[PDB]
Amino acid sequence: MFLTRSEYDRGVNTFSPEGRLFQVEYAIEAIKLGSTAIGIQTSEGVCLAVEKRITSPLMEPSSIEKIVEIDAHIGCAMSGLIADAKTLIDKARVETQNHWFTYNETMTVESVTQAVSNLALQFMSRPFGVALLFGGVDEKGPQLFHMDPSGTFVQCDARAIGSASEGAQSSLQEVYHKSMTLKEAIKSSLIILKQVMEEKLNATNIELATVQPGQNFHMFTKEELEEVIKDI
Amino acid sequence: MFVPCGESAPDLAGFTLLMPAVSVGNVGQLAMDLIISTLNMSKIGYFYTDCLVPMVGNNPYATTEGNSTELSINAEVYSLPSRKLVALQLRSIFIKYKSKPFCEKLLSWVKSSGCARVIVLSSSHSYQRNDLQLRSTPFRYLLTPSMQKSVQNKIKSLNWEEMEKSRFCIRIPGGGITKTLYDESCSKEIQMAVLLKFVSEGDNIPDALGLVEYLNEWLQILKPLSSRWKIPSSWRLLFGSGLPPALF
Amino acid sequence: SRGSSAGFDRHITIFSPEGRLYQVEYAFKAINQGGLTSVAVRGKDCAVIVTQKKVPDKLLDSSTVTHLFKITENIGCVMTGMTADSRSQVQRARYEAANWKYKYGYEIPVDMLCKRIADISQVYTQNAEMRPLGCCMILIGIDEEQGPQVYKCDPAGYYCGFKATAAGVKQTESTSFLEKKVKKKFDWTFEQTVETAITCLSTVLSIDFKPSEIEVGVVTVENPKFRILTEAEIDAHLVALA
Amino acid sequence: MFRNQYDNDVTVWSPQGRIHQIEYAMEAVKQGSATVGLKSKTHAVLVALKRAQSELAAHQKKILHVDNHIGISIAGLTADARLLCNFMRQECLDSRFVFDRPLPVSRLVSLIGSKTQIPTQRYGRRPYGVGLLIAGYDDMGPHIFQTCPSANYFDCRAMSIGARSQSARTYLERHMSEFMECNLNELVKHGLRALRETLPAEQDLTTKNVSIGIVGKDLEFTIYDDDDVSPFLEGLEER
Amino acid sequence: RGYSFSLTTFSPSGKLVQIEYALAAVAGGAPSVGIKAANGVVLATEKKQKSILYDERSVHKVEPITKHIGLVYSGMGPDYRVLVHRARKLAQQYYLVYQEPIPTAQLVQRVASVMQEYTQSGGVRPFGVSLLICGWNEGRPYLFQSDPSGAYFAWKATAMGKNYVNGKTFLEKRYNEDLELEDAIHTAILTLKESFEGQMTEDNIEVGICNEAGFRRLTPTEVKDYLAAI
Amino acid sequence: GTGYDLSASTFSPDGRVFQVEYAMKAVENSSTAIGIRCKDGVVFGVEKLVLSKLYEEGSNKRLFNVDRHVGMAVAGLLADARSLADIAREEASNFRSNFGYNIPLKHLADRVAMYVHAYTLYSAVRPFGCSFMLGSYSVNDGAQLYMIDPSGVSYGYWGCAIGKARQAAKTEIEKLQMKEMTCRDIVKEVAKIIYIVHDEVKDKAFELELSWVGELTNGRHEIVPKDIREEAEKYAKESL
Amino acid sequence: SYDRAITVFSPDGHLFQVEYAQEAVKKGSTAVGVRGRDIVVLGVEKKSVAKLQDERTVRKICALDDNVCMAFAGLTADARIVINRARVECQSHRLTVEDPVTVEYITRYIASLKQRYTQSNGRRPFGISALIVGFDFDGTPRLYQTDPSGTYHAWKANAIGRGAKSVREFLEKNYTDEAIETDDLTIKLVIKALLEVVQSGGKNIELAVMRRDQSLKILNPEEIEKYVAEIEKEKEE
Amino acid sequence: PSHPLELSEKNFQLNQDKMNFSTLRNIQGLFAPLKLQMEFKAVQQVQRLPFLSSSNLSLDVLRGNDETIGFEDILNDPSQSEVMGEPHLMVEYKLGLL
Amino acid sequence: RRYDSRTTIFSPEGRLYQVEYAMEAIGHAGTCLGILANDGVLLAAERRNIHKLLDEVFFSEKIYKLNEDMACSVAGITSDANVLTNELRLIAQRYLLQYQEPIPCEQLVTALCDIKQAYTQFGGKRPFGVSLLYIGWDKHYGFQLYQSDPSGNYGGWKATCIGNNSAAAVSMLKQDYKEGEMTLKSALALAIKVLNKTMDVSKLSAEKVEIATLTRENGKTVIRVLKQKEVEQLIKKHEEEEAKAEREK
């Protein structure tokens, strides 16, 4: 009857006595150090909102590093290690371009989603440290997807990722309904980000984009954001 | 410090001290269990510190249905006044930066209560052996210069072999607090003897069964060899639970 | 893959302070795991190999228990050590002999086969993935211009040619007996060589043999093909000896 | 205490002749929701329970589509389930293209087991941590199969896997003598009743946390969920 | 002690211990000597098979590489065999390319380059042998030595194997530059006899010589005649 | 063998490989299977435990069918046994394709044994954890019976037993004059031995699996008819 | 623990070896970069100027192309490989597309190359950080920074190496729209920023200046001394 | 391509290995080619970095080319190559990263 | 220590202990010296293979010729030095074939240092324990002198030393070196003085020192190794000058 030491969390291919992958769990915990992102899917579009978290006034805020365009109808969002998403973004772009060139029609979001998932499930010898929020519209309609460092995608309707995700998810649960409007979705995203963020809300601390069946992928500019902020 | 189980501390007027060291394979702890179980010692107090990880459990030495429900902790003291023997058992592992204060406190208690000598059972790593040691006996001993001459003469008669020195300093890899205890005893003029064995981790019951006989060659607390030791009731499931079905 | 193990005697590619390879030395003690002893003696115009047969269970089919093998139509073998390792090495020797014949147009000699096997065995002691085989090989044959041949190779990759050798548990006693006999005389007929081998085994093991406890294989200048003796012939030799 | 040295790799035997990593992997099946599968003389039914979670943030799929006559349910890791489903789909497609005919379920399961056995022996890999229930229909009648992380498969009349499936298994064993002589509706009712036993007393089955898969004589594999399960749930008793 | 097991690990003082242990393995082999005379080189060694049960024309420790090159070793025989084969192949390749017999120095450099590779990669083990190489080029003799680490030196006379420090001490005071071949053979046999630990016979030592006519291994009759002469 | 028993490419100081020993010890974690050859053929018997009432009758069979004339009985880890059965089927098919006639049992046993032994030399793999027996009958060769163990060793047998209680089973087998009996007389003895060996305290309930290959099936391996199995079970139960 | 392998996650989501690779950067010489209105200025501290040393071979400012230059801090041998790879990639991209390369493009290439070496246990990351500065085709000055982990950002003024904290604190309050009016003012600002952590006068300063439609120019010690004297006179006044 | 012998000369060791493996599998069984391939891989996994010339001693011993000279050994010495790439690029190419 | 088992691990403070140990291994080798003058470059080394039974072949034991314009000297492990020198010769010949013009010295040094650096980044390899000194002439910068480290670092010097007592030799050279007004004779005298004060021998002898010189004559570069007579004359001149200086006190 003695107490001894045992370790099961130093390998990516090791099972604990209760059947857990502690390296993957730690990789998932690693995305709690990133900035907060919010994505809401409506009947006429998807809105993606992130915060920039400018550490120093000398840093140039005009840089775009959190929202990326995959194609004319697909957006993206990121949280965690931004340097880890470059390969996934490149593969998604290559796959969608090749499919469009070959078939002469745009692929659905699910196809590029599965193509991305087929690359993340190769542990590079370690799991990724980033979380994605794919958004877009297709013949079926607007739809939203979420990914974890585990390498698998799921479909959702209102998801928040980042450090302050629990309160944002609680607010999204106590707000929101099935038949709503894109403008009020954008507004509610602004309010929720305003409570979540520690500092005040300006035209440069955040950036958001949207995709709708009418136009192509569109990213809001400073002039457009100011009217929405003033609308609050 | 020593906290008595009752109201007054017993008179340990220079009996002996038998203690283990938390080393590779837990050989010292297993040997201590064997000795305590065989001699049928009785608990007399506690050694309460803040250097070991806490743990609790029921009585590890149970023979009847009335003594099997006694709570135990990670540091306890057993005594046999007839033979003038005292035993200490450690059932846990040390916290970081907490070994030297523990050794200092233990040696201060040993000096304060008043004991003839201290005997430590330990072990060392087996893969750090040179060519000459690979073909020799795996048992070694060590004595403080303050030790009595009669003990030295007896050990010389026993034809034992002493631990080798390295450039000169004493090094015992995988020995835990053995080197610290030896150095402090040398610096504080305390009679202490150390016995160890080269082992590897795995099933280490035979190593303890050999170490107890090695000690008995000198102390002779039992009839000389020409079973003898009582296995405690807590040595039941040393590999885990049972076999799941639908596999073999 | 796994990685090497720390210690002076726990990996194959680690030297000791005296420059010894304890993992190679431990493979020489696996030869004694079986508990049998082999004896090979070379005569004036013949070569003989004698080994020990032990069938403890009565439910075994004794026809399937053997340690004498046929590598080529003119080369015989006897193996001492681990059974599966011995069989695998026999298969490898057959493959190497076939390759030699295909490449060079004539049959391989005994010394060349032993050298090739030893060369293969040497590689296993320098790489951190393979392990040596716990067995030793003894080969006999007839050379068209030199006569009978007796060769032996070790798990370390060392081979040599002898006039009489032994392997197994009682190798040292067999070696001393053979040294005395060879010092006394070395020119023997066919009947004297087999009697010498049988007497060596009997004297060393302190046992009286039955025709079902030993195996005998011979080659001869007159009949170069490898042959395995039968129980009747073994009993005839034992009766003549006694 | 003596197991610490023999339970870190899958290619190491213990002094007791056991491999502990395989058992640890088998322990990962019981971290998913319960699933129940059963078959009749003409039909095979799969019933799954969706995790108690807000539907806004996740829409998990526990029943998947492999072919026109094969469907599976999963419990355990998700990446392994996706890999296995891709392998089965590719095998079925290749079989059809080469020799156009339905692929036998027994041969598919044999291929799955042969594929799964290898990582339990090679170094540098780990066993799959997912358990599958397979319902199919070929020219032998309906079939129900179960797969294990230990590369073993079984032929079952009715099986339940997942977390706290002992009660479901007990119910299935108690009511197993009246499954062949039933129609689709009664079989689905029996499956739902069996699945209901893995819940506390107060809760009940609603049209928000149940999925159904059916295959039979001339009916291809179909998945019912959301409001498609109301006709099956509208005839149940209280408890 | 933590740096004594790995081959690709430097000690804090900047030392490689496994190469030292390979050299220790070399230092525990059978003795061998080599003396460069005014018109030839002589190599001598002590046999391992000191028994009557040994076939004389089966395995030899003194081997030829080309008509004018031969070598002897001290250490592990299995490691020596493969190096001998590689040296023979390299000499044949050089002759094929340049239509001229290879000089001794080039062969020594190539063999040392082959030996050096096994001391810088993980998962392998250094060779446990040291070689003595003799040759005759451009009307003058040569004598080289090669360590397990891949370093080579040129000697006038040297000894290696068991008890080689005292052998070198003997050679230092018993060596003369303007020395003939027969006296060189006598000196080599005496140096070998210094630490034989037994009684020498023409059947437990091997001798080879190199001169204008080329490398050649001596027969037991000549060895017996020399032993009787001294 | 502490400190020398983590890889299959390591020797102990006394010259032993302990990973192979642990693999061979793993075979005793499963039930017992026996096989006896007689004047006419070979008969197999397995003590199969009951796991649950929800399984079908023909699930988890431990008596395989390698080819038209070869039958197999396994014990130990089941996935390894299935892999080895697939290997044996591949070998038999290859030999039949190449040479044009049925492979002898000795050559098949040698091939499978060498394949098993190939896994005990490297540190990138682990030894197999199962044992099995092969049996066949031919007019020009007679009955044959072999065993292969995780070490990679094969032998011919007159009576064999593998599994948990492989010692009491051998003791019971050693009391039969099996060289003068027929298959119909050996089926009952096999059932009786299986019933005697089984322990009903640690275990709960077991079934009986039986098969033979011999003259009465024209050298074809198949399951015992139900009536004969029932009669043998009745005789075995009455013997107790 | 959790820091003896490159690809092991801490229980709270940290890769400690990649963080240790930045302690090497935090021990190099200070480098400062400032983006002006129509000029870009670089500056590197010179440390341990040996008497018998040749200064031509120990320069820490390099020219990647006709309009891109870079400065680094960290291990000296690791920077050479990255510089050569970037130099080759610039010409490769010029072959691919006729137009001259972009500062952001070359920064992304360098970042991807640095990130490639943090994926396996068989190789170690690059212990350097860089300040990439240059001009675009239209004529807009740019400034970027790269980390050993593979992340990059856009700045208006930054510092790396030891003393970066104090230099950045000085720059945050001394960088306005008036101090960047002229090239002389920008150079004076860079020298003032360097002088906070550099002792022994202005003899330990290396400066580089790039203008529109011109090549990289390295200022002379006499010019540096003249600027230092002007700054001292203005401060005294 | 340019010559009938170019493709044949480029792929000779592969074809010889395939023929030996097929013959060995047909004669003995599945185990022998498996063991041969594992030994080949094990002895080939250790060597110098790709921008320096190796010797391949153990691989040559295993294959049996330690007593044979061909035209690949006397023509166009690979050790004295006239062109060589950058070290890091060669190492990355060998790993498949490029 | 838990951060010094391989070359692919960083310490918490950002250090490479294996590379540091490899650099420490250089201190056991012999002394090598190099001096730059107005009309030539110098290289002086210390002989370590001194023994009565050693033979004298080749032209030198520590100085090698790389091409018609360059030469080098090594200190460290001879087996690695051989590989490095062979690679240097191959690189020089490759550049000559490519461009029909001799390779510049800095280009050659950088080419070798890239190889030396590549062995400290990929695991499973042991870095080279060798340091080198290079001398040469080219049309771009004239006479030059470089140094290299086991880690892959190089630099250009006017006078430097590697090996035993390197710090003392560097201090003496720094104290007593004049910049811009040095000739070959003064450089040789300074080298003799530094070697005498560096080597732990009471009396310097000409059989344990080797000197090489590089210079330009009639549009050609001349590399020669000095003779024992010249070395003895230099040593005698230094000794008599020291005696004169001591006496004039």
Residue numbers in the entry:
A (entry chain D): 1 to 123, 133 to 241
B (entry chain J): 1 to 167, 177 to 235, 243 to 264
C (entry chain G): 2 to 243
D (entry chain E): 1 to 239
E (entry chain A): 4 to 233
F (entry chain F): 5 to 244
G (entry chain C): 2 to 238
H (entry chain H): 44 to 141
Task: Reproduce the article's own wording on this structure.
Dedicated assembly factors orchestrate the stepwise production of many molecular machines, including the 28-subunit proteasome core particle (CP) that mediates protein degradation. The CP is composed of four stacked α-rings and β-rings, each containing seven distinct α or β subunits. Unlike conventional proteases, the proteasome harbors three different types of active site (β1 or caspase-like, β2 or trypsin-like and β5 or chymotrypsin-like), each present twice. Previous work identified five CP chaperones: proteasome maturation protein (POMP, also called hUmp1)29–34 and proteasome assembly chaperones 1–4 (PAC1–PAC4).
Key differences between structures 1 and 2 set the stage for the β4 incorporation seen in structure 3. One side of β4 binds a composite surface from β3 and the β2 propeptide, while its other side binds the α4 region that was bound to PAC4 in structure 1. Structures 3 and 4 are analogous to recent structures of yeast 13S and pre-15S intermediates, respectively. Structures 3 and 4, as well as the human preholo intermediate, also allow comparison to previously determined structures of the corresponding yeast 13S, pre-15S and preholo intermediates, both validating our approach and revealing conserved or species-specific aspects of assembly. In structures 3–5, β2’s residues 225–237 face the α-ring and cling to the adjacent α2 subunit.
